[PDB]
A paper describes a structure:
BoNTs are synthesized as a single polypeptide chain (150 kDa), which is post-translationally cleaved into a di-chain molecule composed of light chain (LC, 50 kDa) and heavy chain (HC, 100 kDa). LC is the catalytic domain and a zinc-endopeptidase, while HC is further divided into two sub-domains of equal molecular mass called the translocation domain (Hn) and the membrane binding domain (Hc). Inhibition of neurotransmission takes place by proteolysis of one of the SNARE proteins that mediate cell secretion. Synaptobrevin (or VAMP) was identified as the [name] specific substrate and is cleaved at the Lys59-Leu60 position.
Author numbering:
A (entry chain A): 2 to 443
B (entry chain B): 509 to 550, 567 to 911
The structure:
Amino acid sequence: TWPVKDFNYSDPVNDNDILYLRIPQNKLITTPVKAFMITQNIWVIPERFSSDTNPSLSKPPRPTSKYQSYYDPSYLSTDEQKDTFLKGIIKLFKRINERDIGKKLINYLVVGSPFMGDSSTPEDTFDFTRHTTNIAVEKFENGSWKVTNIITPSVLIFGPLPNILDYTASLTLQGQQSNPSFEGFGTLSILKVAPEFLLTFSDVTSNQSSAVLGKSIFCMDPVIALMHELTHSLHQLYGINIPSDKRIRPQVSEGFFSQDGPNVQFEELYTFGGLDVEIIPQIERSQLREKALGHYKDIAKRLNNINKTIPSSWISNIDKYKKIFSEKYNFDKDNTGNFVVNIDKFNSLYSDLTNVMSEVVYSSQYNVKNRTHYFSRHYLPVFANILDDNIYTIRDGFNLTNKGFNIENSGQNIERNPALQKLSSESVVDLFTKVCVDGIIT
Amino acid sequence: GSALVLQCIKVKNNRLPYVADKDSISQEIFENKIITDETNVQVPINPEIVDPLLPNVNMEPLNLPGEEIVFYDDITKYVDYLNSYYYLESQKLSNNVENITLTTSVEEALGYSNKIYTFLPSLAEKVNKGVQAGLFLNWANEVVEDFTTNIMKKDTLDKISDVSVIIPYIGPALNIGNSALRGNFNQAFATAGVAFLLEGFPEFTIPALGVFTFYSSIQEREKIIKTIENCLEQRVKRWKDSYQWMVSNWLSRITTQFNHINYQMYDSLSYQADAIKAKIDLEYKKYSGSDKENIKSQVENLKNSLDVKISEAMNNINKFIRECSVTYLFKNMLPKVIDELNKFDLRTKTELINLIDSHNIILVGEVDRLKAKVNESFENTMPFNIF
Ligand SMILES: [Zn+2]
């Protein structure tokens, strides 16, 4: 168990775990932003996010996504809301450490820092001057922001996009940042989460349902929603992230009715897991393993030949980063002294990050109702105050014993729980497939 | 009768089935291939938190372009009959109703606000009667008794199909393939088959598989036999990988559309219970007597029992729809895949026979007789099963 440190937004900058960070990836906020380190190399930044040129938190005229959409400029602006947001994720990170798979998940994220280099860097060099590994720390010296120090984080946990219900925000990478995440080196993850806001589903299709009560409309447990996003960080960090080029595309055609859906990427099917992984055939899934293997072998051979560094003053730290990335990828040592990829330990590692670490696996482990197949219907989303222990605890989530919520009569049910408040359909934006005829009919 | 329908129904985008594009899945099985001599594939403890700061380094500014904003448009879809979405809208209650009454006609329920559609003729009788100068629970329980018995209906079709039983009231509830009005859900489902439930969905069809070829020379001794054994490995792979493609299409395109009927029927059954709940409450206000305040506790339990009794009916529909989804894969998709695989086998076999006919003299101590007998590999085929 990696310890989850407690924080307030009122707490001052201590030049250790609370800092001010320069994030060029966020267009919405040009200035440096206040950050907190809840655990080793996993930072929370209670701020809204946007990658678009000419960004805006306000509601657009027409829908910008195929998903169910909800906007709010008020969310995560004042310090009271940032204090709520900070405690929220801190509370969720404690709930992750309740089961064993969550302790294992966090451990991978902590130790698996991104490699100091890429395809551009030659074999004999560590590059310590890249944005995929480094983030700049800054003081406010005499009416201006000066660059003081750096950090080497694994996951940066921002607030939501303009669309608060956007779950694909974590998959957004800009090609030059992405190339490390494909080719084994990895990159620091930038998550955009909204704990209080929840997606909702029902068990109408699944016969595994309450015969006592009936078919319920339930919410995703925000720990599972967070752990879902953290599995993309896991893939981004260990350099086995499948590209956004590899995707499923929706078919819309006149003749039959269908969803004008989004593109469901291969990463999204991997991170969800279960039967829907078989949508990607084995001929493609095998190719990704063989590619990942080759990159891990070439990264081991890089560690054998390194002598210089960029910048030139980091030659003393060559043995330091040899120890960090050897433990990450879990290389062995052959009869020369060089690093080598143990194939049995690679297969064990790669299968853990793809098959074991997934949403369907978490939902069974944490004893919570959840989506059974990725294409389960999205119902009207909900809001919930997770910080109040009468609504949501660390040990059991929404399903609390004292308020008359057993596992069949789950607290996740919106009908049977008043704490799961609904968002109004006036604010919630949607696309529509318009069913018309304009005829007499019989 | 006829009724001029001049207005649209706005169905939400994410309350429709996701159907993937056919080309978007995987093209590997349809690609051509050349076979060679070596084609072959197949802790956390309690630690201490460290100071995360490090010495500053000169980073150049990473000039990110930024994402372009894209506005998405709605879809209009013109249809030639009152399909499932029209039949669903008829069943809904209006905004702040007063005195609702059930009706057997869909066009009346769409036009008039108070009138609500029902797919159960017997229910339309017993609901609209009300408390006819008698006791409250005498009528109220007869409505729920009639509601329960009708939603548990199952008709046993025989002769054709692996589907054991079908649920008949889906026809008048959703008007699948214009089944209602004509009134032959049971007949049409048997005649057309399991694909009837997919409204206007293009019939499944698979294009021809990729062709195997070899080198022109292959002039070395041992080399021609060394590659023919690898050709038979890739044949087994093609059967294996074709079945995985078939499943990839089924999971992303077919299963999603069948579950749409599960969702639609739950909405349908929910609107019927909302109509019964509303009518009981309206008739409760209209009723009066000495035994009225006594039965209050009992009547609220009868309202809550509707939610349980829908789940009993849904577990039958889930069982029914699950069969339809699985039997589609067996009888609509799989035969077309096996037929195309048998064409691929015959085309690959004629290639292998003519490969040996081209190379008689090389590498033989008369092993042609031995190698021609290895066609027994084509005799047996790779099966496919479910569960
Ligand atoms: Zn995701």
